[PDB]
């Protein structure tokens, strides 16, 4: 009665608050809305779906799984083909993060299949990107970052992302393109198709620069740096690694300053400028002191000592070694 009205109102404050960067409050409003309760089952189910998504973004995958599973069940109750496909996708993506790869696959496939039956091309592209991500995580998860199931999972992600790119091109979805170019690039990378990794990551660059997505932009320079190292072109990687270090400064991200610092530190180890590693790995040990990742200070000390052993300063290297001995 008066509740089926205060429920939806309470949902909107939950909804609004999550687009505004505060899901931690919006959840409380979603949870409040559920306490009150409506009797329109598509409305309650939609609240479950948003509780699920809000907990996803907040990193409570456990309670996220629980809410998407509820929304899915209601969808089957109600017979809402389209609700069921979206809840299947969300279950899928949640299970993927939990490492329930095999069930992730079935759920994303259910999302895709219904999307296709309905001739929903937006749903089909989203379902395709989700299925790709599952295969991609499945293969990335195996071992250290041999088994033929790895190659086969990764190859399956390549086909899925390429299928997705083809659909979101046709739909004009520049942001979807960038996301598929990045995951596709990183998949080609793990397969040893480095020439194809560069091609995809250059598309992600362009689209990130276009949107002004300055986090994505450095993301691609770094990923580009990775791929040139394995290509053996260490000077290009250095070029790309520096570019990442700059965007880290303006972003005021002392973290990716360091990761970019250590990595171009390690890159010139292959180029004999042990100073660039020194000058960087000291910025590494400094910022890692700031964030208590001093663990890497020993990694910097282990790399700095070994640049030193090729290049003098034996007493400074033993001091680095002495600190590395700290753990």
């Amino acid at each position: 009665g008066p509740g089926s009205a205060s429920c939806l109102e309470l949902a909107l404050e939950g909804e609004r608050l999550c687009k505004s960067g505060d899901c931690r409050a919006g959840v409380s409003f979603f949870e409040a809305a559920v306490q009150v309760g409506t009797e329109d089952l598509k409305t309650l189910s939609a609240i479950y779906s948003q509780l699920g998504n809000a907990y996803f973004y907040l990193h409570d995958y456990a309670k996220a799984l629980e809410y998407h599973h509820h929304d899915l069940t209601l969808a089957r109750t109600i017979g809402d083909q389209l609700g069921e496909a979206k809840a299947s996708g969300n279950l899928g993506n949640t299970l993927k993060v939990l490492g329930n790869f095999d069930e992730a696959i079935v759920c994303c496939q259910r999302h895709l299949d219904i999307s296709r039956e309905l001739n929903d091309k937006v749903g089909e592209a989203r379902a395709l990107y989700n299925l790709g991500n599952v295969y991609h995580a499945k293969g990335k998860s195996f071992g250290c970052p041999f088994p033929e199931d790895v190659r086969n999972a990764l190859q399956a992600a390549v086909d899925l992302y390429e299928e997705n790119l083809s659909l979101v091109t046709a739909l004009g979805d520049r942001a979807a393109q960038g996301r598929a170019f990045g995951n596709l690039g990183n998949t080609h990378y793990l397969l040893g198709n480095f020439r194809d990794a560069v091609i995809a990551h250059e598309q992600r660059l362009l689209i990130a620069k276009e949107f002004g997505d300055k986090a994505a932009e450095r993301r691609a320079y770094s990923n580009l740096g990775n791929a040139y190292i394995f290509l053996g072109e260490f000077e290009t990687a250095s070029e790309y690694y520096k570019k990442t270090l700059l965007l880290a400064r303006q972003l005021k991200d002392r973290a990716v300053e360091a990761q970019s610092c250590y990595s171009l530190g390690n890159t010139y180890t292959l180029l004999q400028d042990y100073e660039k590693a020194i000058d960087y790995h000291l910025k590494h040990l400094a910022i890692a002191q700031e964030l208590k990742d001093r663990i890497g200070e020993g990694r910097a000390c282990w790399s700095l000592g070994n640049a030193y052993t090729a290049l003098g300063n034996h007493d400074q290297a033993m001091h680095f070694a002495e600190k590395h001995l700290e753990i």
């Binding site: 939609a46 779906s49 809840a87 993506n93 999302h111 990378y189």
Partner: peptide, 15 residues
């Protein structure tokens, strides 16, 4: 290797 975000389906609130 820095990936791309996952993208969930949103099921907005009906009137």
């Amino acid at each position: 290797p820095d990936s791309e975000p996952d993208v969930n389906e949103v099921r907005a609130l009906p009137q």
